[PDB]
Amino acid sequence: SVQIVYKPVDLSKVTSKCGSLGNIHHKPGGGQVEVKSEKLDFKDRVQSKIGSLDNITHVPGGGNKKIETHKLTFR
Amino acid sequence: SVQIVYKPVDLSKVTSKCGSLGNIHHKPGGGQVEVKSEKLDFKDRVQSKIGSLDNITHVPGGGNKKIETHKLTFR
Amino acid sequence: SVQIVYKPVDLSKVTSKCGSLGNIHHKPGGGQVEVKSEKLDFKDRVQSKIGSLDNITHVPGGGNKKIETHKLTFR
Amino acid sequence: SVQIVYKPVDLSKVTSKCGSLGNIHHKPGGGQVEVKSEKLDFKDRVQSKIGSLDNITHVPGGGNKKIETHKLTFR
Amino acid sequence: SVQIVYKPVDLSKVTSKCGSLGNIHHKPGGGQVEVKSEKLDFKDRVQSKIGSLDNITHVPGGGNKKIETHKLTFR
Amino acid sequence: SVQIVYKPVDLSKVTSKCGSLGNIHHKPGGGQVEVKSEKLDFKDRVQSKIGSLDNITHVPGGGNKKIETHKLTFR
Numbered sequence: 001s002v003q004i005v006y007k008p009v010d011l012s013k014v015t016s017k018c019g020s021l022g023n024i025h026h027k028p029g030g031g032q033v034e035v036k037s038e039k040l041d042f043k044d045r046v047q048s049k050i051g052s053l054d055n056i057t058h059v060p061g062g063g064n065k066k067i068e069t070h071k072l073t074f075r
Numbered sequence: 076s077v078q079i080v081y082k083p084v085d086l087s088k089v090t091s092k093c094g095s096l097g098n099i100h101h102k103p104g105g106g107q108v109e110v111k112s113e114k115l116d117f118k119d120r121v122q123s124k125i126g127s128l129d130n131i132t133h134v135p136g137g138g139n140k141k142i143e144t145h146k147l148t149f150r
Numbered sequence: 151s152v153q154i155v156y157k158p159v160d161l162s163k164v165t166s167k168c169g170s171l172g173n174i175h176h177k178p179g180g181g182q183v184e185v186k187s188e189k190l191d192f193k194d195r196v197q198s199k200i201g202s203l204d205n206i207t208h209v210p211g212g213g214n215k216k217i218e219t220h221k222l223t224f225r
Numbered sequence: 226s227v228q229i230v231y232k233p234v235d236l237s238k239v240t241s242k243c244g245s246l247g248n249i250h251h252k253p254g255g256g257q258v259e260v261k262s263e264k265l266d267f268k269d270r271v272q273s274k275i276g277s278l279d280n281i282t283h284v285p286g287g288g289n290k291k292i293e294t295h296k297l298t299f300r
Numbered sequence: 301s302v303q304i305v306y307k308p309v310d311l312s313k314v315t316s317k318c319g320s321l322g323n324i325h326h327k328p329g330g331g332q333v334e335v336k337s338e339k340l341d342f343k344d345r346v347q348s349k350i351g352s353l354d355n356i357t358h359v360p361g362g363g364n365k366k367i368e369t370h371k372l373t374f375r
Numbered sequence: 376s377v378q379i380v381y382k383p384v385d386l387s388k389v390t391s392k393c394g395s396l397g398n399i400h401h402k403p404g405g406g407q408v409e410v411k412s413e414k415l416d417f418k419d420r421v422q423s424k425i426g427s428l429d430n431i432t433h434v435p436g437g438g439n440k441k442i443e444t445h446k447l448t449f450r
């Protein structure tokens with residue numbers, strides 16, 4: 001005989017209050033970029049990125065995160 | 076005979092209060108960039124990034140995080 | 151006979167109060183960058199990053215974190 | 226004989242630059258107001274104001290002012 | 301004979317630069333107000349103000365001011 | 376014979392630079408106010424103000440001021 005009771009209770013709270021949020025300024029890559037190449041030999045795969053790439057401004061009002069995992073394994 | 080009771084109780088709290096949040100300024104890469112190359116031999120894979128890349132401004136109002144794992148293993 | 155009772159109680163608290171938060175200035179890479187190369191031989195993989203990359207401004211209103219793990223193992 | 230030449234030259238400048246302007250919160254009179262009167266005799270004019278009156282939020286983008294007066298008086 | 305030349309030259313400058321401006325919070329009169337009166341005799345004019353009155357939030361982007369007066373008086 | 380030349384030259388400058396400006400909090404009158412009166416005789420004009428009145432939050436981006444007066448008087 002085997003009896004297993006799995007009764008986790010979650011009454012938790014993840015909250016945030018922000019009176020005002022803003023005046024955010026993100027300016028990447030305002031400088032001049034010059035790339036001058038001459039007599040280059042590439043014998044394999046080439047990946048090149050020039051300029052302003054993949055810059056992120058992320059401004060969530062809350063941005064609160066809850067991660068919870070439940071696992072019952074029986075053998 | 077085996078009896079197992081799993082009754083965790085969570086009444087916890089993750090909170091934040093912010094009266095005001097802002098006036099954030101992020102300016103990466105305002106300087107001039109010059110890359111001058113000549114007579115380079117590459118015999119394998121090349122990855123090149125030039126400029127302002129992957130800069131992040133992240134401004135969450137709360138940004139509060141709760142991670143909780145529950146694991147019951149029986150053999 | 152085996153009896154196991156797992157009843158952890160969490161009434162904890164992770165809180166923060168901030169009256170005002172801001173006037174944050176992050177300026178990486180305002181200086182001039184010059185890279186001048188000549189007669190370089192590369193016989194293997196090359197990774198190159200030039201400029202202002204991967205700079206982070208992270209300004210959470212709370213930024214409070216709770217991590218809790220529960221593990222009951224029976225053999 | 227009387228000769229009068231009035232030739233003022235104005236090449237002046239009143240300018241302003243604002244990158245962003247906002248997140249302004251004005252909350253007057255959030256408190257409870259109770260006025261309880263009994264057996265008052267007024268024998269003349271009465272002016273009464275109760276509550277939230279005449280509060281101003283004024284947010285001009287420039288709000289720049291130039292005042293100039295020119296006066297030539299001859300007798 | 302009388303000769304008068306009035307040639308003032310104004311090449312002046314009143315300027316301002318603001319990168320960001322905001323997150324302004326004005327909360328007057330959040331407290332409770334109670335006024336309890338009994339058996340008052342007024343024999344003349346009465347002016348009464350109770351509550352939150354005439355509060356000002358003034359947020360100009362520039363708010364720059366130039367005042368100049370020119371006066372030529374001849375007798 | 377009378378010769379008068381009035382040629383003032385103004386090449387002046389009133390400037391300001393502010394990288395960011397904000398997170399301003401003005402909270403007047405958060406306390407409770409109680410006014411309890413009984414058996415008062417007023418035989419003349421009465422002015423009364425109770426609460427939060429005439430509070431000012433003034434946040435100009437520049438707020439720069441130039442005042443200049445020119446006066447030529449001849450008798």
Ligand SMILES: Fc1ccc(-c2ccc3c(c2)[nH]c2ccncc23)cn1
Nearest residue numbers: 049053054055056124128129130204
């Ligand atoms: F289905 C998807 C969804 C998303 C992406 C994805 C997102 C972001 C980036 C990316 C790929 N590669 C990068 C390199 C440098 N910086 C940022 C990124 C690819 N496949």
Ligand SMILES: Fc1ccc(-c2ccc3c(c2)[nH]c2ccncc23)cn1
Nearest residue numbers: 047048049052053054055056128129
């Ligand atoms: F079905 C889909 C859906 C999305 C994408 C996807 C999204 C974002 C990016 C991407 C691919 N590759 C990148 C490289 C650099 N930076 C960003 C990205 C592809 N397949």
Ligand SMILES: Fc1ccc(-c2ccc3c(c2)[nH]c2ccncc23)cn1
Nearest residue numbers: 054124128129130131199203204205
């Ligand atoms: F599905 C996805 C989703 C996201 C990405 C991803 C995100 C960010 C970056 C990335 C890849 N490579 C980088 C290199 C340097 N700095 C930042 C990043 C790829 N695949």
Ligand SMILES: Fc1ccc(-c2ccc3c(c2)[nH]c2ccncc23)cn1
Nearest residue numbers: 274278279280281349353354355429
């Ligand atoms: F033609 C006009 C135009 C405007 C007004 C005017 C404006 C503002 C106010 C006012 C009168 N009396 C007040 C008392 C207390 N606080 C503010 C004010 C009267 N006549």
Ligand SMILES: Fc1ccc(-c2ccc3c(c2)[nH]c2ccncc23)cn1
Nearest residue numbers: 272273274277278279280281353354
């Ligand atoms: F033709 C006009 C045009 C305007 C008004 C006018 C405007 C504003 C206000 C006013 C009168 N009396 C007040 C008392 C308190 N607070 C504000 C005001 C009267 N006559």
Ligand SMILES: Fc1ccc(-c2ccc3c(c2)[nH]c2ccncc23)cn1
Nearest residue numbers: 279349353354355356424428429430
């Ligand atoms: F035409 C006009 C224009 C404006 C006003 C005016 C403006 C502001 C106020 C006012 C009168 N009396 C006050 C008492 C206390 N605090 C502020 C004010 C009257 N007449």
